[PDB]
Design a protein around this ligand. Structure first.
Ligand SMILES: Cn1cc(C#CCn2cnc3c(c(/C=C/S(N)(=O)=O)cn3CC(=O)Nc3ccncc3Cl)c2=O)cn1
Ligand SMILES: Cn1cc(C#CCn2cnc3c(c(/C=C/S(N)(=O)=O)cn3CC(=O)Nc3ccncc3Cl)c2=O)cn1
Ligand SMILES: [Cl-]
Ligand SMILES: [Cl-]
Lengths: 122, 122
């Protein structure tokens, strides 16, 4: 029935990423060892079972700082956060294992499955 | 270079819409005459020049209630808000003029242009 705008979802995500680049309406800092990364909780929830579980919980929804497991690699996390905001996943032989283990921790099954495909094709 | 996830932007927007349906992390009420509609400021900014201009402004960024022009038709606004969260625009002969005038007010040029195409094809 309704008219479908094929580029609209991509346009929305690009503009969310532009807001993240300007720190506009970002509402959380994710701390990963010595690094930290600002984001929108809504985008994190949309992209991660871990962040969904954290922020749906009424005890945690209002947190402004989330400390990740100190074993998580900041580069693997940064790669996945950039994927969340762009639809683009930079998998390479040098980062595949860190990215895949981080995607398991963040509960991102389709990314984990793509990492398995990458390993199988290598 | 990077791996492109074709469904990712659509997945993000669907999950933002699911959060809006549960009123999770919505941060504004838009008042349109006797009706009101909750939303995420980030999605409104991504989809509307009017909301972009309102919430980028440091005097207005923290507002939790925005009163629209009392001449705006609530049904036309609801149609456009649903489009923002779905990529689907329900244009019909009975609503085209209200939708098009509302899209002008919200500063949504590609929607206005699609409304002109609808008129031309009618
Ligand atoms: C150890 N291990 C665990 C897993 C897993 C898992 C399941 N699992 C749960 N949750 C997910 C995802 C994705 C995938 C993204 S991706 N990048 O893979 O395509 C996003 N989310 C959040 C989500 O569904 N959010 C909402 C749902 C309904 N309503 C509102 C919202 Cl916000 C997701 O895989 C993988 N390994
Ligand atoms: C009287 N009259 C005025 C107009 C107009 C206009 C221009 N105009 C300005 N702004 C827009 C749009 C759209 C279109 C959406 S749509 N539905 O038409 O495709 C979205 N936005 C917001 C936006 O660009 N936001 C960001 C930009 C950069 N960085 C971060 C963000 Cl959040 C947009 O058309 C039409 N009639
Ligand atoms: Cl802000
Ligand atoms: Cl909330």
């Amino acid at each position: 029935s309704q008219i479908q705008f094929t580029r609209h979802a991509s346009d929305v995500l690009l503009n969310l990423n532009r807001l993240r680049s300007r720190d506009i309406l970002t509402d959380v800092v994710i701390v990963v060892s010595r690094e930290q990364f600002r984001a929108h909780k809504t985008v994190l929830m949309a992209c991660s079972g871990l962040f969904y579980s954290i922020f749906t919980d009424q005890l945690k929804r209002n947190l402004s700082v989330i400390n990740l497991d100190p074993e998580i690699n900041p580069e693997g996390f940064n790669i996945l956060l950039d994927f969340m905001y762009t639809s683009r996943l930079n998998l390479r032989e040098g980062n595949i294992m860190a990215v895949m283990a981080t995607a398991m921790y963040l509960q991102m099954e389709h990314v984990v499955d793509t990492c398995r495909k990458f390993i199988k094709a290598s």
